[PDB]
């Protein structure tokens, strides 16, 4: 049978995520996050239980999606053309800018020419693509690396604790973490707004994908998706 039939027979919609106040947070009894809330409503729409699996590594998320270990990715993921070989994006929900973060009390960098330490980002993130682009063009001196086991949220926490000098994160996540870690500061903006979307496996089977688009249509219809977006942004 088709993808949706299998989901219905499992009685569960398997969604892979990353822990963050914007995506999926369990810092108290009731979980929260935009991706979590939208995924719950989607599971309800399909008539199945939601099964969330938070990961740390984006490359792993895409491998799971390709291996049918999960049904969709809902993890604050920025559009990345390299992911289209095996995956397809759902509709765009909101946009975020990429910002370079440093810790208050330490020197404020003025540009990528002025960094003292390394900038570390999450492996497979769109943040990584941006750094590669800049190093091959305007900043040959740029010292950067990728973290295989830390998320953008965990990387921001490291900057806050003084264990990492800088990270390149998204504007929405930075804003939320700042209310818990006021020592996090923006040195400068790096990119203009980029859209966030869910990802699904590319297949000739649209039993799930078409349902996702039907669900999205219903959500937009009375301005309900806008309200939800604005609540977390
Ligand atoms: Cl990303």
Swiss-Prot record:
Cellular component annotations (GO), alphabetically ordered: cell outer membrane
One example of a Gene Ontology biological process annotation: peptidoglycan catabolic process
Main localisation: membrane
GO terms for MF: peptidoglycan lytic transglycosylase activity
Entry annotated with the keyword Nucleus: no
Protein location: Cell outer membrane
Domain of life: Bacteria
Keyword match Cell wall biogenesis/degradation: yes
Keywords noted in UniProt: Cell outer membrane, Cell wall biogenesis/degradation, Lyase, Membrane, Signal
Coiled-coil parts of chain: none
Region listing for Non-LT domain, in residue ranges: 3-233
Its job: Murein-degrading enzyme that degrades murein glycan strands and insoluble, high-molecular weight murein sacculi, with the concomitant formation of a 1,6-anhydromuramoyl product. Lytic transglycosylases (LTs) play an integral role in the metabolism of the peptidoglycan (PG) sacculus. Their lytic action creates space within the PG sacculus to allow for its expansion as well as for the insertion of various structures such as secretion systems and flagella.
Family membership: In the N-terminal section; belongs to the bacterial solute-binding protein 3 family.
Domain-related comment: The N-terminal domain does not have lytic activity and probably modulates enzymatic activity. The C-terminal domain is the catalytic active domain.
Protein name as annotated: Membrane-bound lytic murein transglycosylase F
Section of the entire sequence shown: 35 to 265 of 486
